[PDB]
Symmetry: C3
Amino acid sequence: DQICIGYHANNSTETVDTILERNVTVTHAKDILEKTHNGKLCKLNGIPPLELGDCSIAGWLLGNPECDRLLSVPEWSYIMEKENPRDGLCYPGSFNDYEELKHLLSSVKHFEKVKILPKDRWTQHTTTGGSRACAVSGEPSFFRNMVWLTKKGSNYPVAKGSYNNTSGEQMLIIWGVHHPNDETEQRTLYQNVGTYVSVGTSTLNKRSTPDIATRPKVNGLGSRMEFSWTLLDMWDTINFESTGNLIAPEYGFKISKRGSSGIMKTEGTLENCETKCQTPLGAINTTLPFHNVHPLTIGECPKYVKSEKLVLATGLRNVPQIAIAGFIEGGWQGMVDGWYGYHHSNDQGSGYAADKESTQKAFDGITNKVNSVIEKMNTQFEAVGKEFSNLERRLENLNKKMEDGFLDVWTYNAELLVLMENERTLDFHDSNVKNLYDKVRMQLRDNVKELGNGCFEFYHKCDDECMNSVKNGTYDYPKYEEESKLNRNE
Amino acid sequence: DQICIGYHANNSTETVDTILERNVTVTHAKDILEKTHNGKLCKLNGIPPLELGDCSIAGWLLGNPECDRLLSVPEWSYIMEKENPRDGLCYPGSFNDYEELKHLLSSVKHFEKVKILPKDRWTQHTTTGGSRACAVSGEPSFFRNMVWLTKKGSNYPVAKGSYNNTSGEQMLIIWGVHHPNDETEQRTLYQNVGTYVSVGTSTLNKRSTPDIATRPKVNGLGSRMEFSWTLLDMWDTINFESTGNLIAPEYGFKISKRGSSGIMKTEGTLENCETKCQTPLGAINTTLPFHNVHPLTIGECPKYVKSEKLVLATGLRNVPQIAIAGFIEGGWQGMVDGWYGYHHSNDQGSGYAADKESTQKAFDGITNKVNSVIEKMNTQFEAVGKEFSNLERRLENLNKKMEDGFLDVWTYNAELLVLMENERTLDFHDSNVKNLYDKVRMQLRDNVKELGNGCFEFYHKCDDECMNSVKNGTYDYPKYEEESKLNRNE
Amino acid sequence: DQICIGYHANNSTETVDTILERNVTVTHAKDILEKTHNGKLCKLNGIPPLELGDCSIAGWLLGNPECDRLLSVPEWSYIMEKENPRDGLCYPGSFNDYEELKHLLSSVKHFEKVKILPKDRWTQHTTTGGSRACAVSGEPSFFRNMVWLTKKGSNYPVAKGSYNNTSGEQMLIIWGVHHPNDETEQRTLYQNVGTYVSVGTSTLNKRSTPDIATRPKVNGLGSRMEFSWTLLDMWDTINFESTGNLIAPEYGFKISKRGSSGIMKTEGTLENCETKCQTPLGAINTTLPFHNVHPLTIGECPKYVKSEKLVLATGLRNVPQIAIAGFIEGGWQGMVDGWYGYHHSNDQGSGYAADKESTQKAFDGITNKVNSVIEKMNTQFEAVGKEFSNLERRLENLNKKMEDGFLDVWTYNAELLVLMENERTLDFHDSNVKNLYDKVRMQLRDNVKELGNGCFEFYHKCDDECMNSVKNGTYDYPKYEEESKLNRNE
Ligand SMILES: *[C@@H]1O[C@H](CO)[C@@H](O)[C@H](O)[C@H]1NC(C)=O
Ligand SMILES: *[C@@H]1O[C@H](CO)[C@@H](O)[C@H](O)[C@H]1NC(C)=O
Ligand SMILES: *[C@@H]1O[C@H](CO)[C@@H](O)[C@H](O)[C@H]1NC(C)=O
Ligand SMILES: *[C@@H]1O[C@H](CO)[C@@H](O)[C@H](O)[C@H]1NC(C)=O
Ligand SMILES: *[C@@H]1O[C@H](CO)[C@@H](O)[C@H](O)[C@H]1NC(C)=O
Ligand SMILES: *[C@@H]1O[C@H](CO)[C@@H](O)[C@H](O)[C@H]1NC(C)=O
Ligand SMILES: *[C@@H]1O[C@H](CO)[C@@H](O)[C@H](O)[C@H]1NC(C)=O
Ligand SMILES: *[C@@H]1O[C@H](CO)[C@@H](O)[C@H](O)[C@H]1NC(C)=O
Ligand SMILES: *[C@@H]1O[C@H](CO)[C@@H](O)[C@H](O)[C@H]1NC(C)=O
Ligand SMILES: *[C@@H]1O[C@H](CO)[C@@H](O)[C@H](O)[C@H]1NC(C)=O
Ligand SMILES: *[C@@H]1O[C@H](CO)[C@@H](O)[C@H](O)[C@H]1NC(C)=O
Ligand SMILES: *[C@@H]1O[C@H](CO)[C@@H](O)[C@H](O)[C@H]1NC(C)=O
C-alpha cells in the first residue's frame, strides 16, 4: 500500500513575471490589459457624433458658406475635428478666447439657433455687404449668421440694437469688428473716421476702436476681422451701439442640453457601429482595469498605462516530470479535477484523486485577490483634452507634465503590484501543498513510513475505506496500533 | 504528562480586510481613519477668525456702508465668507484682479489702515458725492474709504496727489474709475468730455478713459465703477492725475503680519472652542494618519481619503475553540497573559502559561510596523482653496484635476498598504506559533511522543521543574535518556 | 561522524531598515542614493554654457552697452543667470511677456543675429539718440541692437519699414514704445502730439499710444520704455508704421539650432570640467537611480527624493556565533566560499564547504530583484524651472504644489519599497537555509540521528565519498540500511 501527495500540471505555455524570476510558466493566468480596438469611429451610447469635416468650430458658429450642411445640427455625443481644418475664417482675422469657447463646448451636447436680431430691422443701413474671400459660385458673399452694416447713400447713422434673453437658458452671442486697410476703404464703407463699437451687458462692458494700417495680404486682403463672444444669462439684456465697423449677430445659440462631451482630433469618418468607449484610433470593448491604446479617450474607459504586458498568475507553476512520486519531483498530468490532491496504490487497484477543501480555499483566495486588484480602481467619465494658444506655452507645459506624472505613477503602481502579487501566489501554492503533506503526516504518525518523495508506505493493509478515511481526516490510529507495531519492529 | 502549545483568543468582534479574505475577525485591531467632528466653527490656535457676515472682501476693503463693524478689525487666523455675499459693491461695477487679491489675502493675518490722502486736501474740487445705491437712513452716501471727486462751481481742474511709503511695510491701495451712462451725466459731474485717469509707480503705468454707453440697469443705475488695486513697496511713491472720472483712495492697508491663513466658505456663525484643524463642517481632534471629513482644511490635518474603512490588524485571528488541545484545533480562551504560550498537565495540577520572548518580539514587530505606516506620512500647514473667474475655466479644471488625481493616488496607496500588511501580520503570527512548536520538538527529541493536535506526551515523569526547563530552553536530554528508552520500547 | 548545515558570516557593519525592525546588520548591502557632487559648473556633453554674468536676458537681447561681450555668442548647452542681475534695462521700462520669452529660450540652443533693418535706411529721421542712463565713458549712448528715431530739423514724417523672412527659420524681433514725462519732451523729440506705433504681421495686429504723465524717478528719469516681442514665421512679413515714439529694431534673432536647454540660477563661474548631469550646486557622476542633491537639474539625472538613506539588503543577517553547531545558533566565519554550505567531520579530516546550486539560485534572485527595482524607473530629459510675474501668483502656487506633491509621492514609494523588499530578502534567506536542512533530513531518513542544532549524526561510518554523495544528492539509503539498523538498536 502507498499514498502520495502532489499537485496538478497541464500543457499550458502561459508565462508571468515575478520580482525574483522572469518567464515563469503557469497552469492558468489572467490578463488585465487590453491592447485591441476595432479601428472605427462609432456612436457613443446610441447618439451619433457631430462630424465637422473640413470645417472648424469658428467656421461652423459664424456660418462659413462652405459649411452650409451645419445650419441645423441635431444632438451629438462628441465633436470630431481635423487637426488643421481648411474652411474656418474665410475673411482673415482672429477670434478672442477661442480656446475658452472650445472648452465650453466640451460640456455642451445640443444647441438651438434663435433669431435674436432680424436682418430687416436695420432699415437705416445697407445689410447686403459681401467679400470675394467668402465667395459662392464666383459672386461675393458673407457669413450666414452675421450681418455686415454699411452706409446707406452717404449717411451712417448710429446703429442701436437690444435683445432680452427670454429663451429659457444661457445664450452664446458672437459679434465682430472690422479693421480696414486704408482710410479710403473706411470712408467708402462707413463715411466717418473715428468710429467705435460698444457692447454691454449686466456684467460686460467692451468698447473697441478700428485700426487702419497696411498689413500682409492673407486670402488676398490686407483687412482683418476681430470676433468676440459672450454668454448671456437668463432674463438679461445685451446692447449694441456703433458708429461704424460693426458686424452684427443675427442668431444666438441657446444651450438646450448639457452633459459630458469633448472634441476629438481625428481625420477619419463615422461608421455604422455602437460603443461605450471611444479613442481616436478606434472603440474599445473590454472589462479589464488597464489598456494601452491611446491616452486621449471619451467615455467610461479603463486607465491608460505604458505597459506591454500585465498578467496575473492564477494557477500553479508548470514543472511536469512526475512507482509514482509526489510534489517533490514535480507536478502530475493525471489529476484533472483540482489543484492539490492525493494518489493511492493498494490491492484493489490504484488511481488519482483531488482534495476539495484545500482547492476551494485556494480558489476563493485567488478570486478575492484578483477582484481586489481589479475593483480598487476608480472609473469615471474622462474627456482629457485641452487647447492652448501660442502665448500660453507655460500652461500647456504644466498640463503636459501633470498628465505625464500621473501616468508614470499609475504605471509604476500597476507594474509593482502585479510583480509582487505573482510571487506571493506562487509561494502560496507551495505552502498549501506542504501544509497538506504535514497534515497527513501528523494524522498518520508512526503507522506509516516516509520515503522522501512525498509518499508514505503503510505498515498495515489499508483498503479503499481506510484510504477514504485518510483523505477525509478520519483516520483511526488506535484501530491499527497493534497491527502496525508488529511489522515495524520486525 | 502533556505540554501543549497554543495561542490566545477572546470575545472581540472587530474585523479587518486582507487581500485574500474579507471580514476576518481579529483579537486586536487599530483604526487609522477618523470620521467624526464637532460641527462648530471656532478658534484656531487661540486667535479668533474674521467673520465677514453678509459682506464680501471687496465691500470690506472699499468700506461699504452696510459693513461699518469691519472698519477696524483685529488679528485673525482665517476669513469666514459666505458663498454669495449680499453686501459687496453697492454701486454696480467690477473689480480687476479680484482673485489675485483674495489669494494675496490668503497669506495675510493683520492689516493696519493708514490715512495716505486726507479728504480735506482736495481744496479745488467737491468731495461730498453720493448715490442712492449706497444709502444710509434714506440719504445718499458712498464708500467710507474712498472719495468721489466732482467739479466745484463750473470747473474741474487737474487733480494731483502723491504718497511716499514711509510706513515700514508693503501697502495695498485701491482706486476706481467712473463710467457714466450718457453725456449729460458726464457734463454735470465733470464739465469735460474726453478725460483720463493716470496712476503711476516705479513698476506701474496705467491710464484709463471712461466709456459712455447705455447699459442694463443694475441696482437702478446704468453707470458702472471699475476698481483696480496695486501693491506699493517700501520707500516707493504713487502718483495720481486725472481730468475727470476718478474715485480716489483715502486709506491704505499695510501688511502688519504675514503667515498662513485662508478663506473658508461657510454660512455658519463663530462659536467657542480651541482647535487646531478646521473644516467647513467642524473641527477635528485626531492623532491618526487619515480622515474623510472634508477635502478643504485649514491647519495641519491628516491626508483626506475617499475610504470608509481603514483598520490595521495588530493581533491574532480569533478562532474560539481550543483533554486540552493545541493550536491545530484553534485558540485558547483561558490564556489571558500573552499571545503565545503553553499548557502543562502533570500530577501536581495543570495550568496555562505564556512565552515572554516570542510575545515581546511579536509586540515590538507589530509596533514598529504600525509606527512605520503612520510616521512616513508628511504633514504640513496646507491652505488648499483657490478662486477663478468666468474666463479662466481651463485653469480651474486643471486645478481640480490635479487635486483629484493626487486624492485617488493616496487612496489607492493607503488601501493597498493596509490590505497587504494585514496578510503579512496574520501569516507572521502563524509562523511564530509554528516556530515555537518546532523549537520545543527539536529540543525534546525522542523522549516525547507527538499527538498531532499540537502537544506532546512525555515518556518519563516530568515534574514542575522539568516543565519550567522545557519552557526555559535548558531541557537536559541526557538526564532522562536512559529512562526514556526503557518505556519507549515496552 | 556528523554533518551540519549553516550560513555565512563576516565582519561587515553595514545596516539596513525593514518594516518590523530597525538597525539590522547585513553581510552585504547596496546603496541606491547618491549624496555627492563636484561642486563646480561644467560643460554639458562637451558644449560650454552661456555665462550671462551680471546681465539679464533682456540686457543681452536688447544690447546693453555694459554687456558688449555677448554680441557673437556661440552655441550653448544651458544658460547661467543670476537671481538679481545688475545690468538689465538701463533705460527704465518694462518687457511684455518676459516669462514667455524666457520659457521659449529653454528650447533654443543657438541664435544667429541677422541685420533686417539697417540704421542707414532712415534717411528722413535722426538715428543718433541717446541717454545718460545707458552711458559709456561718460558720453551718452543707447542699446546696440535698437534704433531711436527722432525728428530731423522740425519734421517727423511717417516712418514705414518692412522685412520679409527669407533667412530660413523662425525669427525673434523686439521693438519698443517710448513714454515721455511731459509734453515738452514729446514736442522736443517728435514734434507731434497724438502719435501711434503700429506693428503688423500675418497673425499679429498691435497698435500703441504713448502715455505722458509724471512718474517717480528711476535711474534719474521719469520716462519709460515698453518693449514687446514677436515670433515671425518663415516667408512672412512684419510691417512697422509710426508717427512717433518708435524704437525700431536693427537685428533679428534666427533660431539656428533647437534642442533641450534651460536657465540655471547661480552666482558661480564656469570651470574646466565635463559632465552629463548638472545641478546649481555641482555636477553628478552616478549610475544609481536616486539622488538628493537639488530638485532642479539639467541633463540625464536620477530621480530626486527627500530621503537621507536608501540601502538595499543583498546578503544575510550578521549573527556570528558558531563540536561545531549549525544555523540554529548562528552563522559561520570560516565558510568563505558562498552563502549556504555544510561542515563535515569524519576520520579522514574536517572542514567547510558550500552548496553552489542554492547559492546561485539565491544570487540570481537577489540580482533580479535589484535590477527590477532600479530598471523600472523611467528617466528622461527635463529642464525643470519656470518663472512667473507678480500678477501670476496662483499659477506659481499651482506649479509649486504639483512639484511638491509628485516629490512626496515618489519619496513615499521608494521608502516603502526598500523596507518591504529588505524584509522579504531576509525571510528569503532564512527559508532557503531551512529548505536545505529539510532536503538533507528527507534524503537521509533513519540512518542519522538529529541533534537539534542543525547537525546530523550518522549511525554508520561515512567516508569522504559518502559525504560528497550527501552533498550531491545521490545518497544511497539501501546501501547502508543493513549496517545502520544494527548500531541503532544496540
Ligand atoms: C523572457 O521572454 C521574452 C519573450 O517572451 C524574452 O524576450 C526575454 O529575453 C526572456 N527573458 C529571459 C530572462 O530569458
Ligand atoms: C426681460 O424680460 C423679463 C421677463 O419678461 C423681464 O422681467 C425683464 O424686466 C426684461 N428686461 C427689461 C430690461 O425690461
Ligand atoms: C462587447 O463585448 C461583450 C462581451 O462582454 C459582447 O457581449 C458584446 O456583444 C460586444 N459588443 C460589441 C459591439 O462588440
Ligand atoms: C469522510 O469520508 C469517509 C469515507 O469513508 C466517511 O466514512 C466519513 O464519515 C467522512 N467524514 C466526514 C467528516 O465527512
Ligand atoms: C463584510 O461585512 C460588512 C458589514 O460588516 C458587509 O457589508 C459586507 O458585505 C461583508 N462582506 C462580505 C464579503 O461578506
Ligand atoms: C521717500 O522717502 C524716503 C525716506 O523717507 C526717501 O529716501 C525718498 O527719497 C523719498 N522719495 C521721494 C520721491 O522723495
Ligand atoms: C531559566 O534560565 C535562566 C537563564 O537566564 C536561569 O537564570 C534560570 O535559573 C532558569 N530557570 C530554571 C527553573 O532552570
Ligand atoms: C574585515 O576583514 C577584512 C579581511 O577580508 C579586512 O580587510 C577589513 O579591514 C575588516 N574590517 C573590519 C571593520 O574589521
Ligand atoms: C540606527 O543606526 C544609526 C546610525 O547610523 C543611528 O543614528 C540610529 O539611532 C539607529 N537607530 C535607532 C533606532 O537607534
Ligand atoms: C517673401 O519672400 C517669398 C520668397 O522668399 C515670397 O514668396 C513672398 O511673396 C514674399 N513676401 C511678399 C509679401 O512678397
Ligand atoms: C565619473 O565616473 C566614472 C566612473 O566610471 C569615472 O571613470 C570618471 O573618472 C568620473 N569622472 C569625474 C569627473 O568624476
Ligand atoms: C556528483 O554529481 C556530479 C554531477 O555533476 C557527478 O559528475 C559526480 O560523479 C557525482 N559524485 C558523487 C560522489 O556522487
